Write an enzyme that holds these catalytic residues in place. Sequence first.
Site, PDB file in Angstrom:
ATOM      1  CB  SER A 222      -0.912   0.043   1.145  1.00 17.12           C
ATOM      2  OG  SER A 222      -1.732   1.075   1.039  1.00 17.12           O
ATOM      3  N   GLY A 223       0.586   2.146  -1.058  1.00 18.46           N
ATOM      4  CA  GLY A 223       1.281   3.348  -0.997  1.00 18.46           C
ATOM      5  C   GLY A 223       2.590   3.293  -1.904  1.00 18.46           C
TER       6      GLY A 223
ATOM      7  CB  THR B 227      -3.799   3.227  -7.748  1.00 21.50           C
ATOM      8  OG1 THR B 227      -4.285   2.120  -7.106  1.00 21.50           O
ATOM      9  CG2 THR B 227      -4.696   4.067  -8.390  1.00 21.50           C
TER      10      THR B 227
ATOM     11  CG  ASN C 264      -2.190   5.285  -0.554  1.00 22.47           C
ATOM     12  OD1 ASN C 264      -2.283   6.664  -0.761  1.00 22.47           O
ATOM     13  ND2 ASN C 264      -2.223   4.609  -1.691  1.00 22.47           N
TER      14      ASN C 264
ATOM     15  CB  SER D  97      -5.653   3.077   0.803  1.00 19.37           C
ATOM     16  OG  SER D  97      -5.203   1.846   0.586  1.00 19.37           O
ATOM     17  CB  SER D  98      -6.977   0.576  -3.861  1.00 22.10           C
ATOM     18  OG  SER D  98      -5.818   1.708  -4.883  1.00 22.10           O
TER      19      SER D  98
ATOM     20  N   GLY E  27       0.108  -7.005  -3.243  1.00 18.36           N
ATOM     21  CA  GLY E  27       1.273  -7.836  -3.391  1.00 18.36           C
ATOM     22  C   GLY E  27       0.991  -8.733  -1.941  1.00 18.36           C
TER      23      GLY E  27
ATOM     24  CD  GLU F 201      -3.377  -6.983   2.164  1.00 20.32           C
ATOM     25  OE1 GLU F 201      -4.261  -7.591   2.927  1.00 20.32           O
ATOM     26  OE2 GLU F 201      -3.718  -5.922   1.731  1.00 20.32           O
TER      27      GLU F 201
HETATM   28 MG    MG Z   1      -3.951   1.888  -5.084  1.00 20.07          MG
END
Ligand code: MG
Length: 736
Positions: A180-181, A185, A227, A230-231, A451, A453
């Site tokens: 994440s971050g 995206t 993030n 964050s998605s 990826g 976690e």
């Molecule tokens: Mg994302």
Amino acid sequence: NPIHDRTSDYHKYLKVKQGDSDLFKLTVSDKRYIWYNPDPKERDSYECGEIVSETSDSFTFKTVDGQDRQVKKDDANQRNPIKFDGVEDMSELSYLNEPAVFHNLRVRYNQDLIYTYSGLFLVAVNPFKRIPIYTQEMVDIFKGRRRNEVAPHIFAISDVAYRSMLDDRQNQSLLITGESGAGKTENTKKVIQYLASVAGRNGVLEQQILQANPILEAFGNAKTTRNNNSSRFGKFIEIQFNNAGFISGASIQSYLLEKSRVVFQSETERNYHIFYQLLAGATAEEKKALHLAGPESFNYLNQSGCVDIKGVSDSEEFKITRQAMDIVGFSQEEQMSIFKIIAGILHLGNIKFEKGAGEGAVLKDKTALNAASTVFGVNPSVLEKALMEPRILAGRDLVAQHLNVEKSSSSRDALVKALYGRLFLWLVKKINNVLCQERKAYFIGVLDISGFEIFKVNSFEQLCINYTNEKLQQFFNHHMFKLEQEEYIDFGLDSQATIDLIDGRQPPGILALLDEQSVFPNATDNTLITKLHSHFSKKNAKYEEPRFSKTEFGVTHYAGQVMYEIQDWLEKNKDPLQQDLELCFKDSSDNVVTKLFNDPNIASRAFITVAAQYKEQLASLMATLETTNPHFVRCIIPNNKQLPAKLEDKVVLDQLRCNGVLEGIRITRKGFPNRIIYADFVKRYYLNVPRDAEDSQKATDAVLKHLNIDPEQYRFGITKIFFRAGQLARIEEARE
Ligand SMILES: [Mg+2]
């Protein structure tokens, strides 16, 4: 020509700056080195030691602190020659050790070169600051250029994919993974940007394709600790093309949306963007029609303490979102309704259940309640009943049950979650009809998902994601086992056991046992975990039953062991919603609401469980991938603090270790990592032969011939020579 103009931004921003002299001579120095750890606790740390002595089988080098040390030649992390500092593909390095790998990436990143190749991967490291390399002008440069002909860049991978598609008449894929971050995206959006330009029809469809995003980002993204944007869902975007190479359409597949965020957020985090967009930007008029107030007025948004993001105007973003809704085509009709759903959710969140007379739930105030009903266009008395007095089957009997405060609350929460996830699904279906093409010729799909976690606490969603990751990693290794072959041992065999432990049918793996447990209403977390240990403790080599914990179990993943906690798995697997609640909502006046409860494609899973559904969607995705020519992008976060200019070695190496780059490296390192062109070898190594010679191969035996390097160290194949690991550096390490 920006690629020839050493003064262009292309040069500034994407290349290692070039001087006036190209001579092999400048580079000279006699001083060798190795990468050592001045303290072995912490192994991702290294310093450069000048090797000053050589035993027969080990070195003795000089610490930065001046103290000398000894080392085995076989445990030695040899530092590549300085000429290699900054190369574009790590595959060009002689010494392929991890610190060597880290060093090249760092040298680049120190120059703000965030993209680098490692064989088949594009490594992308978040700079945590804006670099102006995504302009149209930068787009333009990548057009039709080979990988090797331009600097590393997401634009590049994208071009190579589009050309491959046109040239081989084969569908393609870009798999963009990482923490994440990391910039997954961001990079995903650049791929689409790029495609839209190199192949759009100079447009409506393209604008729509582009506006869909922001739409999905408002409803599926949120501020988290790692993030700001964050998605909270994974996605596979299929960019569709006609046979002439023009964009003809698009499709989005969404996965594992974080429904719980709607009802709860950790300290400092925010709920989904949209809540805040609605509240900040609603006309002062809808506010009323919708019964709005401020975020502080809402339990679902007033818990984390954070209701804002710096550098962000929820109001403006709301303008943006509705704008996208228009482009894509949602009627104002549709839009109030979406907004209403949102409003409703908020209201449902403010409903306080109390302790009435005994043990059962009551509702003294009905305010929030009617606000909710109003907006959804449901019957408040029905809702109320449906919430606290759901009828439950107990034989042939259908009896209302008066739930206590807690139970009522959770049920309430279940409704919100269903409402949210369903709405999300509907948004996605709607976008798809506008965009999606039945009759497409080819496609380029982009997967933007996390990826592996490994968090402080790993639950069901973590296992899901890790399960997908084992499959993608094995797909990679399998792929590499072909690509490597066709120059001119399949390691994916390796992930099978973990994979089977998760998804196996006979003997049953974790998910099958979970499904089995799910049929029994009175099953518990304990029953479940106990079942898991009974079948796999000391029995499956990839499983571990903990020394003391009674609620966790360990899975040895590709990226290492992950400890999971079992709580709520049964409930997560069933994802229950009281029937009465469905009934209540099956009747909404509201046109959208009704689709959510009335459309089996949205309102249900099959009924399969959540696990069974995840497994099946994973298998379809993989099948899709299996028909494409794939491309791999590994996005790396430089530190855990969202800061520019701070590439933390440990932070970095860890990701490299888990996302498969290091494995990829050390694999080929056992073979012939270097496989240079003949002419190419000659030009810098002539120093019997002069630079631009025409008997290349010969010119190439020649140099090896003077120096008379050992033959099994190098290999003559048409066009290129291969160099086993380390050969190059020494070749490079030799007088003119
Ligand atoms: Mg994302």
